[PDB]
């Protein structure tokens, strides 16, 4: 159907955010936040005024989305008065940040109407000789600025802030970080050159703020499909009634997640899976597909992995949990887990379960380790940065030299939690009380 194909594509483009600048969706609770950001952008490109503001907000709090909308609004009228210089804190390191500024400057100057030539010392020398009828606003977009605010030295943070007060070239720095206390991460001299302009991103307070945001993301305000007038009546009917299924999923996510991009991960596959207009109105009223998405997200955790185990995989995890529970530090190995499993088979058959030999439990023991159930005692695991990951690979741990039957392991789930996720129909329920 050509009518449903135009409505399905328009509804999906609104949730992802690929709409043009002339048809962007602005929420109600975010309207008072983009006005302050627009004031700084309009004052540095038009009025040519140096500014410095570092945004502070949680993850997926519409930080980069608001900055991308301000750059697209100014490009539709003032596209020859400023440039776009983007920076990252995770990709660009300390030495790579110097070459990243000179690289983004030679490609933006040739587009309006070298710098990144030589060694690392000659590159930084040409940058200070350039930044430090009208001028050109050098808009700096810094992402994850908390990584560059190291307590050892902040070289880039000291030179970037110097291009605002002393320098005459209008440089607009828009830092984006997640730390709430970004003022303490700076040095004594770095914080002196900053204007102390920390704009905190607002969050969802009441329940009506999330309803207006979802309604504005699924309402087609353009005449591009004959099913537009029929879809707006169905969406407004389910949202205005608090006893519907759409209002229940919003209230549940408001007290558990309270995030707009998180809830948008389930509305996108709900519309794309609809074959026609009749299937779209049915899934939006009963919300049958939303319950399937919630079960899949909690299917590979500690609860969903227990249902995919056999009778031997459950008996080993139960017998190994009783050893660490009765111990002082919870240390156990393969020899301690085999003693509890062997005493359980002879006790049940005395009141026929095939007793496996010690040569067969080795395959079951290694299968539970890969399934995230038995963690090594006093083990770091995944390192933070790449520095500690290289030093840990060259050092041979003590657990690799000792055999597998003498390796100290730890239980990822205590016996108190196993009794709640096991029904009464199983025969291994009597050995989970101790």
């Amino acid at each position: 159907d050509p009518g449903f194909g135009s409505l399905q594509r328009r509804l999906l483009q609104q949730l992802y955010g690929t709409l043009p600048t002339d048809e962007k969706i602005i929420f109600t609770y975010l309207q008072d936040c983009q006005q302050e950001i627009d004031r700084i952008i309009k004052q540095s490109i038009i009025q040519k005024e140096s500014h410095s503001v570092i945004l502070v907000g949680p993850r997926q709090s519409y930080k980069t989305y608001l900055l991308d909308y301000e750059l697209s609004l100014l490009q539709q009228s003032y596209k020859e008065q400023f440039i776009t210089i983007r920076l990252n804190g995770f990709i660009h390191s300390e030495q790579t940040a110097i070459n990243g500024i000179a690289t983004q400057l030679e490609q933006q100057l040739q587009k309006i109407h070298t710098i990144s030539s030589g060694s690392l010392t000659e590159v930084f020398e040409k940058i200070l000789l350039l930044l430090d009828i009208t001028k050109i606003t050098v808009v700096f977009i810094f992402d994850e600025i908390d990584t560059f605010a190291g307590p050892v030295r902040q070289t880039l943070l000291y030179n970037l802030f110097d291009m605002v007060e002393h320098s005459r070239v209008p440089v607009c720095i828009f830092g984006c970080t997640t730390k709430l206390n970004i003022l303490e991460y700076l040095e004594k001299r770095v914080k002196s050159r900053f204007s102390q302009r920390v704009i905190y991103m607002p969050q969802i307070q009441n329940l009506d703020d999330m309803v207006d945001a979802v309604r504005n993301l699924l309402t087609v305000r353009s005449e591009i499909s004959p099913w537009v007038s029929q879809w707006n009546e169905t969406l407004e009917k389910e949202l205005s009634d608090p006893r519907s299924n759409l209002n229940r999923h919003i209230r549940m996510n408001f007290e558990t997640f309270r995030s707009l991009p998180t809830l948008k991960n389930s509305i996108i596959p709900l519309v794309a899976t609809s074959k026609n207009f009749g299937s779209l109105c049915t899934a939006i009223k009963s919300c049958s597909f939303l319950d399937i998405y919630n079960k899949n997200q909690l299917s590979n955790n500690l609860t969903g992995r227990l249902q995919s185990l056999s009778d031997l995989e459950l008996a080993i995890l139960i017998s190994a949990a009783r050893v660490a529970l009765r111990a002082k530090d919870g240390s156990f190995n393969f020899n301690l887990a085999y003693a509890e499993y062997e005493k359980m088979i002879k006790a049940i058959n005395s009141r026929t379960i095939k007793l496996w030999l010690k040569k067969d439990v080795k395959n079951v023991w290694e299968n539970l380790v890969q399934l995230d159930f038995f963690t090594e005692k006093s083990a770091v695991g995944l390192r933070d940065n790449a520095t500690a990951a290289f030093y840990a690979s060259n050092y041979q741990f003590q657990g690799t030299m000792i055999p597998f039957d003498l390796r100290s392991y730890q239980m990822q789930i205590i016996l108190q939690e196993l009794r709640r996720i096991i029904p009464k129909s199983n025969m291994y329920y009597s050995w989970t009380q101790l």
């Binding site: 004052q43 038009i46 009025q47 005024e49 949680p58 008065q81 110097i98 710098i115 010392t121 930084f124 040409k126 000789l129 350039l130 009828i133 001028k135 050109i136 050098v138 070289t155 030179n159 007060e165 002393h166 070239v169 997640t178 730390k179 709430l180 206390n181 004594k188 001299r189 002196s192 102390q196 302009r197 920390v198 969050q203 969802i204 307070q205 408001f254 007290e255 558990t256 309270r258 998180t262 319950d291 079960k295 909690l298 955790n301 500690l302 609860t303 969903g304 963690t375 083990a379 770091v380 695991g381 995944l382 730890q410 239980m411 990822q412 789930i413 205590i414 108190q416 709640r420 996720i421």
Partner: protein, 457 residues
């Protein structure tokens, strides 16, 4: 190149005069940042105030006369000395030295003192700590050598070269704490040259602490700097008053020609007079001096207060960017309240129930054991313990079906979103551990401000 200055000539007497060479002592990126304007920048009555308050000497009398007298007795007398400048970051340390060099440059043109060369070397504006030798050799000699060739060239030049074919060099050692290395070879070489007879080098070191050579440097480098040190005292409350009044001397208590059509103001159509209350300047300079006495902080407070007043003035009229405007004390007090406030308290009050339950469960475990180190397995057991308190009541079981089953019969009873959210916000901490039960959880923020957010819900 790699050839030092010692192998450039044959002998010592064979070196010609360096002052008559069109290459010693200094003998293209400003055109690409220009564009044509196709509009008109509408400047309101508050635009001229913000531009004059920017960082681009009535409160410094004894400090300006001490640095000028130390250099006047060495340049004319053809000697070498070392001036130490220490103070709070933002008291006019670099600006005082810049005014001394600018005053000495005007006296050199009057045929009074010999000509000198001003070299500005910043420690924080360099990538490598050994890059300061290449910058000094390029400004004095004019060549481009490496860090190893420039170090040996400066020693041979500041010793064997006589004074009849030399020239005074004034080097400003900006950010002295940035050039501090482990071997302490760069800091010692920059101070040992001033103790030579045939040197004629003026070194003006600028740091941030008076006890810097007594803590980082040793007894050898401290004996070469000098016992006399100039301490830059921070600005008080009576010195910051004339600083703001000097930048807005011709703008305060003056009439403007603000247009009612666009909003353009012309400094001498309505006759709008701009006046700033004197009480707002006294209440702002006193708070700045009571914190650190930063010179840039006193200018940023009046600039932020004028920006807030300009936002309400443009919104109430509907101007754009393209009777008497009086800045009261409300704009100044609001400019200082946005910084001294703590957004950590209001951040936890707007979180969801799952995020608020994790904070309430962590604080309850601290009042039972008192160890400031609760594991991840104890928080999960404490959360489930609070749910089963009144399980028989219908009012409490309504939330158990969502936190453990999400309102679905097919979803089993659960045992990550709110955990990683508080970690990136700088509130909660978590050690590097592969286990999810014995992993200790510590609080980064205070404990007094965390309990106030739980009681507000």
């Amino acid at each position: 190149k790699y050839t030092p200055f010692s192998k450039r000539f044959k002998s010592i007497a064979a070196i010609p005069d360096l002052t008559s060479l069109p290459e010693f002592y200094g003998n293209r990126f400003e055109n690409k940042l220009k564009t044509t304007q196709k509009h008109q920048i509408v400047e309101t009555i508050f635009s001229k105030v913000k531009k004059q308050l920017n960082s681009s000497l009535p409160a410094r009398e004894n400090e300006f006369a001490s640095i000028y007298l130390s250099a006047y007795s060495a340049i004319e007398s053809d000697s070498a000395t070392t001036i130490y400048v220490a103070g709070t970051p933002g008291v006019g340390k670099t600006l005082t030295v810049r005014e001394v060099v600018k005053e000495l440059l005007s006296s050199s043109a009057q045929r009074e003192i010999p000509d000198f060369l001003y070299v500005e070397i910043n420690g924080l504006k360099m990538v490598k700590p050994t890059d300061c030798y290449e910058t000094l050799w390029n400004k004095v000699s004019g060549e481009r050598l490496t860090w190893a060739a420039s170090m040996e060239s400066l020693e041979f030049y500041f010793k064997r070269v006589p004074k009849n074919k030399k020239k005074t060099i004034v080097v400003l050692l900006d950010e002295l704490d940035a050039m501090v290395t482990k071997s302490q070879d760069i800091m010692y070489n920059f101070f040992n040259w001033t103790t030579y007879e045939n040197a004629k080098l003026i070194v003006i070191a600028v740091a941030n602490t008076m006890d810097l050579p007594e803590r980082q440097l040793g007894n050898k480098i401290t004996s070469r700097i000098g016992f006399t040190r100039i301490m830059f005292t921070g600005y008080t409350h009576e010195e910051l008053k004339n600083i703001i009044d000097l930048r807005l001397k011709g703008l305060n208590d003056s009439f403007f020609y603000v247009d009612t059509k666009t909003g353009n103001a012309i400094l001498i159509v309505r006759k709008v007079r701009l006046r700033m209350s004197a009480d707002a300047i006294e209440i702002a300079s006193r708070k700045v001096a009571s914190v650190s006495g930063d010179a840039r902080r006193a200018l940023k407070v009046c600039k932020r207060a004028a920006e807030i007043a300009e936002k309400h003035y443009m919104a109430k009229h509907g101007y754009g960017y393209d009777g008497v405007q009086t800045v009261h004390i409300t704009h100044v007090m609001k400019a200082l309240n946005e910084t001294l406030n703590s957004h950590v308290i209001t951040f936890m009050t707007r979180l969801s129930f799952t995020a608020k339950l994790f904070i309430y469960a962590l604080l309850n475990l601290m009042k039972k054991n008192g160890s400031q180190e609760q594991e991840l397995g104890d928080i999960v057991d404490e959360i489930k313990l609070l749910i089963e308190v009144n399980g028989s009541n219908k009012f409490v079981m309504e939330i158990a079906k969502t936190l453990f089953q999400q309102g679905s019969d097919n979803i089993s009873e659960q045992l990550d979103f709110v955990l990683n959210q508080l970690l990136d916000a700088g509130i909660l901490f978590k050690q590097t551990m592969k286990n999810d039960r014995i992993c200790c959880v510590k609080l980064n923020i205070s404990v007094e401000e965390a309990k106030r957010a739980m009681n507000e819900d």
